[PDB]
Amino acid sequence: SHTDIKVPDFSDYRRPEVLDSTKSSKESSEARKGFSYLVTATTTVGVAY
Amino acid sequence: APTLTARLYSLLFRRTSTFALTIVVGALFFERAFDQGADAIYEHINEGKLWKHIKHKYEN
Amino acid sequence: SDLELHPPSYPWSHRGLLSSLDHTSIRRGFQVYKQVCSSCHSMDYVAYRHLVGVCYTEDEAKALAEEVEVQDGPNEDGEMFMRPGKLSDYFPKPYPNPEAARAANNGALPPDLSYIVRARHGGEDYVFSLLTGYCEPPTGVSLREGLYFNPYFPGQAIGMAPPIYNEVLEFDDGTPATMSQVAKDVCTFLRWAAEPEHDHRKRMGLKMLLMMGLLLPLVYAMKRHKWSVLKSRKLAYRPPK
Amino acid sequence: RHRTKKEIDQEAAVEVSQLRDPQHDLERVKKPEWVILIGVCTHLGCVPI
Amino acid sequence: TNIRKSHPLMKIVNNAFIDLPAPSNISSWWNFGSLLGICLILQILTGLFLAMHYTSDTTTAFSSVTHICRDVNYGWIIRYMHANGASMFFICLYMHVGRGLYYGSYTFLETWNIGVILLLTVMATAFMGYVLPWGQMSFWGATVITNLLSAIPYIGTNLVEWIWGGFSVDKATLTRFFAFHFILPFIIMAIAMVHLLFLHETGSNNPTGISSDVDKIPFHPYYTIKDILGALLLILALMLLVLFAPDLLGDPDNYTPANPLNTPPHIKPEWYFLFAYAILRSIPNKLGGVLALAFSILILALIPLLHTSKQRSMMFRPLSQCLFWALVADLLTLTWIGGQPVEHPYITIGQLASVLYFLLILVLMPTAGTIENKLLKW
Amino acid sequence: TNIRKSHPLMKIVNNAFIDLPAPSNISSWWNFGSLLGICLILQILTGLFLAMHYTSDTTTAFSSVTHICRDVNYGWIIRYMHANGASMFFICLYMHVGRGLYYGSYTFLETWNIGVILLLTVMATAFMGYVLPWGQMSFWGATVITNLLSAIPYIGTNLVEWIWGGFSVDKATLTRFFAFHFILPFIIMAIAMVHLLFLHETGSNNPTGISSDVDKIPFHPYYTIKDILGALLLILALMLLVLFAPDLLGDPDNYTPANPLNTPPHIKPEWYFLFAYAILRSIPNKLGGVLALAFSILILALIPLLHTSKQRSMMFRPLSQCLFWALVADLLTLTWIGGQPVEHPYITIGQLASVLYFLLILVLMPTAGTIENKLLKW
Amino acid sequence: GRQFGHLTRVRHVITYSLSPFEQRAFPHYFSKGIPNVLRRTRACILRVAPPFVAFYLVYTWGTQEFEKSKRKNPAAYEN
Numbered sequence A: 001s002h003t004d005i006k007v008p009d010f011s012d013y014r015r016p017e018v019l020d021s022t023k024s025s026k027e028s029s030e031a032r033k034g035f036s037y038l039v040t041a042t043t044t045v046g047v048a049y
Numbered sequence B: 001a002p003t004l005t006a007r008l009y010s011l012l013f014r015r016t017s018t019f020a021l022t023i024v025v026g027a028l029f030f031e032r033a034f035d036q037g038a039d040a041i042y043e044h045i046n047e048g049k050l051w052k053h054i055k056h057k058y059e060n
Numbered sequence C: 001s002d003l004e005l006h007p008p009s010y011p012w013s014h015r016g017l018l019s020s021l022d023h024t025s026i027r028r029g030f031q032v033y034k035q036v037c038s039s040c041h042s043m044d045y046v047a048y049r050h051l052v053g054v055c056y057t058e059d060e061a062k063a064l065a066e067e068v069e070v071q072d073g074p075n076e077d078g079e080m081f082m083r084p085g086k087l088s089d090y091f092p093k094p095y096p097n098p099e100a101a102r103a104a105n106n107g108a109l110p111p112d113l114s115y116i117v118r119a120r121h122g123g124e125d126y127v128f129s130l131l132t133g134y135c136e137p138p139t140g141v142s143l144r145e146g147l148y149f150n151p152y153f154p155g156q157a158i159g160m161a162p163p164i165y166n167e168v169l170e171f172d173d174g175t176p177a178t179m180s181q182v183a184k185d186v187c188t189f190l191r192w193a194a195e196p197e198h199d200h201r202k203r204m205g206l207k208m209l210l211m212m213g214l215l216l217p218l219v220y221a222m223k224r225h226k227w228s229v230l231k232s233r234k235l236a237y238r239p240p241k
Numbered sequence D: 001r002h003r004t005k006k007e008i009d010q011e012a013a014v015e016v017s018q019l020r021d022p023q024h025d026l027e028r029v030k031k032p033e034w035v036i037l038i039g040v041c042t043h044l045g046c047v048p049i
Numbered sequence E, F: 001t002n003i004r005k006s007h008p009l010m011k012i013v014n015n016a017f018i019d020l021p022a023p024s025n026i027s028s029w030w031n032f033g034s035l036l037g038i039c040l041i042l043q044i045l046t047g048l049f050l051a052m053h054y055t056s057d058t059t060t061a062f063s064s065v066t067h068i069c070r071d072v073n074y075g076w077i078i079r080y081m082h083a084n085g086a087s088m089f090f091i092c093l094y095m096h097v098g099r100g101l102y103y104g105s106y107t108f109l110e111t112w113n114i115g116v117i118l119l120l121t122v123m124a125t126a127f128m129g130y131v132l133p134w135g136q137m138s139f140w141g142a143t144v145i146t147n148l149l150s151a152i153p154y155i156g157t158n159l160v161e162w163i164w165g166g167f168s169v170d171k172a173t174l175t176r177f178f179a180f181h182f183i184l185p186f187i188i189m190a191i192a193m194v195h196l197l198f199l200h201e202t203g204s205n206n207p208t209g210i211s212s213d214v215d216k217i218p219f220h221p222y223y224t225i226k227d228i229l230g231a232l233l234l235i236l237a238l239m240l241l242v243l244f245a246p247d248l249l250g251d252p253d254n255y256t257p258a259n260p261l262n263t264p265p266h267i268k269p270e271w272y273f274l275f276a277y278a279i280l281r282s283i284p285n286k287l288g289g290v291l292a293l294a295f296s297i298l299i300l301a302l303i304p305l306l307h308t309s310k311q312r313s314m315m316f317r318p319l320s321q322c323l324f325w326a327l328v329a330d331l332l333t334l335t336w337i338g339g340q341p342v343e344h345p346y347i348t349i350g351q352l353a354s355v356l357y358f359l360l361i362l363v364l365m366p367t368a369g370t371i372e373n374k375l376l377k378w
Numbered sequence G: 001g002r003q004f005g006h007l008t009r010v011r012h013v014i015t016y017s018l019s020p021f022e023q024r025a026f027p028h029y030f031s032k033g034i035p036n037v038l039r040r041t042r043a044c045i046l047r048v049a050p051p052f053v054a055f056y057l058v059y060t061w062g063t064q065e066f067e068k069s070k071r072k073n074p075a076a077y078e079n
């Protein structure tokens, strides 16, 4: 009965490199983290100034 | 050929060392280039400065 | 007298957001100050050195400073002589005692000029209008002695003589000293005599906008990231039976 | 303050019992043509114009 | 074992903004607590740098400030950030109290009350603040106000001269105010912590007034970053003033030194006292005017005794929601009138706004509450 | 239920001096913690009343103080209580640190360390304090000292002029110091609480260094009244000075205004820096002199790393007990030399006392400790 | 103070969530954003707006009558 518990679909929120159920997410692992960290790196570079 | 962001993560963002090193190295060059472009933008939209006024008084 | 009028919007070269003052125009203005106002209007806060970066140059400032004679420090006998002019000291001029301003101009105080643009509502325009305003009294009316007429003035009964059109000059290179050209320049200088920081202020202001223009979006995208876990979270309620 | 003939008469005509602080004008001056006062408002000490 | 939890110091810091459970639910109206904090320190911080250059002494008072603005490297931004931060400290204080009523937060008695104590003190502080440059507004501002204690029966006179150091405002009064303007923000800062202490006892209220225990999130990520962004916004605003419109909220006549002989027919306290100003003079009484002025603020401490509704937030309360905005607009009215001369329209309307204020908080909102109960069948 | 225990505020107060368990055992050497507290507030309190009359500005500095002493109702007692309380604050600070070493209290690292931070800050504060009246000692006192940072390689010059606001001591320097002399005691007061926070983590040490858990008494009665009596004694002393010998500990020449032209061959910092003064000049080096001056105080933070004994208090340690007093007397020596001109006997003896100081704390006491271990068979 | 683990009692609720590095920070920012703020604005205009226009009307009429009270004053004084 706890085997009726499927995780609700998220395609509606997923980053595009991650939409495919047949694609390993390790490929976009670097790219995805890179981006968000670049975002904060720049940010902090901005506060720094 | 991976991605710019990917290659960027591996070589500099992964370790908090290089991550931080990158931003202190990246802040130095940013302060310089942003101050250039900025002041330039500030002058270009002006020109009643004391810059273009000097040409007249090199003497005394 | 109970009724009043307010100034228009003269399109100053420094009215726009990121707009510097006209340094050429600040120059002529100091001239208007020295030849005309300076013999009635104290300017206790500005100095010859303050002019150095702004309008004039090193040697030029020295020279203009030397064209007066101020009472320097006492000497050995407790003297207090006079000396050429430094750069150091300011423009403390017209009168010693404040009431001596009243003894000259009939019972009227020509207030400090460093003040001006920030001490009167409307700023430059009120001084611009008050100078180039000068008009003639219509019916009803009166006046005491020469309590001149001015519409852009509380009560309309000033004590200040209109020292505008007396065409004085030295607008180096060539500039017509008309009433209006003379008024814009005094004001433009008076703006700078009140808010010297004026141009830097706005230069930084540009960077402040330009910086926040990169930061606001960024420090906002950061908060999204972290809250996204919460924003797309899914609830299910599964009670027994 | 040097009061004119007109001002003296106007103060003498005022209805005294209607006043918040009842006082005749002639008991507030020694010479009717001269009123001498402390330039301080009894409410909060500002200067009356 | 995690030192972040057992170290006597960190505990406090863990409890303040790391592990403290907060509603997954709060919105922007909860930011003004950090903003007030930020305000308080930034104020303390620029304020201090001005003190390394300021003076006191009536002769040099005005002169020193100009000295700073013109001579002191960067003295201008510091001076203007201080003066503009002061206004921002009121915008937030105002917004904070606002958030509070709407959402019913005032049900935390001790916390609310410490906050009222926090209000009077920053008011008392900012008042002394503007007397310092020794401008026209500074002198009579410092006069029109202080006097009020002279309305107090039997001893009013004594006190007003005791706070003065003379028979008027001079020598004794500027140094006094500077010193008090220096020690107060520290004391406030303490009180703030006690405010915050009592707050941690219940945790935060939220937009629904319901109770978020069933859905708390860690202050870690969440509210730290939502406080940072927020603070950046507060910086944008403070900098917009300082760097583009330095005197927009400042009375141009606090320039031009003092003069116990003058008094420039106009004169009003800084914007943030206008609503209060309006109230006081909208009463033909020395005693009543000041009595009413006091009640105007001390009524906040009365609000909780007139909570009548069975719900806590106004989130689901249209009737009260209407009276809330009527209150805000009406305060915006008092602010506007306060800013005008005591003449024709302006008198009677500011007189109506006053009555409204007190009748709204004392009769209207409490009744709106009961009717809503009755409508819901509660 | 007893509200004295569950109310967020009282808790703190219950923990501070009501229910807190303390050794049935402590003696008078434990009073200086209250005395330092008292000192701190009384200092803050008279200090503030002087600020409502003081100025800054080099022209009026000296004038204002005399104004206070002569014109200000009671300004004299306030002024003298402030100046004398300042000395008392050192006598206690000194005694406190004394009590500490003897009894091994320093084993509470965090607490001891906060106390060192408390020492440097009140030193830094009191230094700025005496520059204020703008007397002769104030000027060169403010000069001889500050300069020292000019001994720091490569950047010394920059810093000393940055702390100065010019190229010498003037305008920029008096206002600066006043402001810092104003904000420091508040900051100290905070640090004190953290000092006290860490102290409550272990409770108090005692004359035997053993451990009193087996015999604790409530702070209630006991140490509250033994603190009151104590404070009365501190009042007797402070008042004895103020009311009978106001300038006994004060350099008579801080009277007579400043003068960058003069310098009166004598000049020494206030008594409480004499031992330090002696050390610095007992070294023919700009760098070494100041380096040694620093170590002279920063060595307290070194003491715990040289605890060598198997017992905690010196109560049962004759050998160390002797080296302790040799330290005190030797400090009394440095104080005396510091007070004398750099001439014949005085040089070589103050040079010996310095070496002694460092050799005693760094080699002698640590060895005395080990020998005692060996004697006991430990 | 109150810590997680001692807050309150919760029965049978599952909560699925996703890593931030796996989703977008701005899903349908404009697509779903605008419609919603319209919806929240609509939902509240009627309780917020009215008191403000009331002030607005009283502010413009108030200054009006202030000028027309003095300036307009004369008016007529005919003899």
Ligand code: HEM
Residues within 6 Å of the ligand: C032, C036, C037, C040, C041, C105, C108, C109, C110, C111, C116, C120, C127, C130, C131, C153, C157, C158, C159, C160, C161, C162, C163, C186
């Ligand atoms: C371009 C040079 C001058 C400028 C810009 C200037 C500008 C001003 C301004 C802005 C005021 C105060 C206006 C106000 O209260 O709103 C004033 C007051 C006055 N100044 Fe001038 N003025 C100048 C030259 C003079 C001269 C030459 C005299 C000598 C006749 C003079 C004597 C006065 C007097 C008597 C007043 C008092 C007006 C009053 O308050 O009743 N000023 N001036």
Ligand code: HEM
Residues within 6 Å of the ligand: E029, E030, E031, E032, E033, E034, E036, E037, E040, E093, E096, E097, E100, E103, E105, E106, E108, E111, E112, E113, E114, E115, E116, E117, E118, E119, E122, E188, E192, E195, E196, E199, E203, E204, E205, E206, E300
């Ligand atoms: C020194 C000025 C003040 C500071 C620094 C301050 C700081 C804070 C902080 C940090 C919070 C938590 C974050 C938040 O809810 O926004 C808060 C909440 C609160 N404050 Fe203040 N505040 C100050 C003035 C006030 C005022 C004026 C009041 C009301 C008279 C007040 C009563 C409250 C209440 C009742 C809460 C609870 C809010 C809630 O739970 O939703 N405090 N304050």
Ligand code: HEM
Residues within 6 Å of the ligand: E040, E043, E044, E045, E046, E047, E048, E049, E050, E051, E054, E065, E079, E082, E083, E085, E086, E087, E089, E122, E125, E126, E127, E128, E129, E130, E131, E132, E133, E181, E182, E183, E185, E186
């Ligand atoms: C204890 C830290 C503070 C210090 C050291 C400080 C010191 C000063 C000094 C020396 C001045 C005169 C210089 C000037 O006017 O620019 C001043 C002005 C002022 N500060 Fe503070 N103050 C502090 C905290 C505050 C606080 C908490 C407030 C309230 C927001 C405040 C609001 C003001 C105001 C209103 C003025 C006068 C307004 C003006 O500049 O035109 N300051 N302060």
Ligand code: HEM
Residues within 6 Å of the ligand: F029, F030, F031, F032, F033, F034, F036, F037, F040, F093, F096, F097, F100, F103, F105, F106, F108, F111, F112, F113, F114, F115, F116, F117, F118, F119, F122, F188, F192, F195, F196, F199, F203, F204, F205, F206, F300
């Ligand atoms: C702001 C100045 C200081 C204040 C207000 C202060 C306050 C106190 C108080 C109230 C106590 C407990 C009562 C007592 O043992 O006497 C204490 C104990 C202690 N303090 Fe301080 N103190 C100050 C400076 C110092 C200094 C200079 C040190 C050493 C550098 C220090 C390190 C200690 C230690 C180690 C104890 C524990 C004493 C024991 O357990 O026997 N504190 N202090």
Ligand code: HEM
Residues within 6 Å of the ligand: F040, F043, F044, F045, F046, F047, F048, F049, F050, F051, F054, F065, F079, F082, F083, F085, F086, F087, F089, F122, F125, F126, F127, F128, F129, F130, F131, F132, F133, F181, F182, F183, F185, F186
């Ligand atoms: C924040 C509270 C304090 C304030 C407001 C304050 C303010 C002042 C002022 C205005 C003076 C100059 C008037 C005079 O010399 O009598 C002064 C002198 C002094 N105070 Fe403070 N101070 C405070 C705390 C302290 C502290 C913590 C100490 C260190 C025990 C201290 C020790 C001194 C000293 C040494 C002097 C100069 C010595 C002398 O009077 O001859 N005061 N203080």
Ligand SMILES: CCCCCC[C@H]1C(=O)O[C@H](C)[C@H](NC(=O)c2cccc(NC=O)c2O)C(=O)O[C@@H](C)[C@@H]1OC(=O)C(C)C
Residues within 6 Å of the ligand: E016, E017, E022, E026, E027, E030, E031, E033, E034, E036, E037, E038, E040, E189, E190, E192, E193, E196, E204, E223, E226, E227
């Ligand atoms: C020195 C900086 C370290 C912070 C420690 C002191 C500061 C402190 O205690 O930090 C936390 C952050 C404290 N609460 C909040 O901010 C806070 C609480 C609920 C929700 C939100 N936001 C959005 O929902 C909040 O932002 C808060 O913001 O109070 C400040 C007034 C206090 O500041 C003070 O005391 C002053 C007396 C220092």
Ligand SMILES: CCCCCC[C@H]1C(=O)O[C@H](C)[C@H](NC(=O)c2cccc(NC=O)c2O)C(=O)O[C@@H](C)[C@@H]1OC(=O)C(C)C
Residues within 6 Å of the ligand: F016, F017, F022, F026, F027, F030, F031, F033, F034, F036, F037, F038, F040, F189, F190, F192, F193, F196, F204, F223, F226, F227
């Ligand atoms: C305002 C007065 C209420 C007291 C609360 C603050 C004061 C406080 O915390 O009180 C208790 C009394 C605290 N400890 C002791 O006195 C104490 C402890 C062990 C033994 C003895 N005596 C004899 O064996 C003691 O006397 C102590 O004395 O610390 C003061 C420095 C502190 O004072 C401070 O913080 C200042 C920062 C205020």
Ligand code: FES
Residues within 6 Å of the ligand: D041, D043, D044, D045, D046, E144
């Ligand atoms: S009417 Fe209130 S102070 Fe004059």
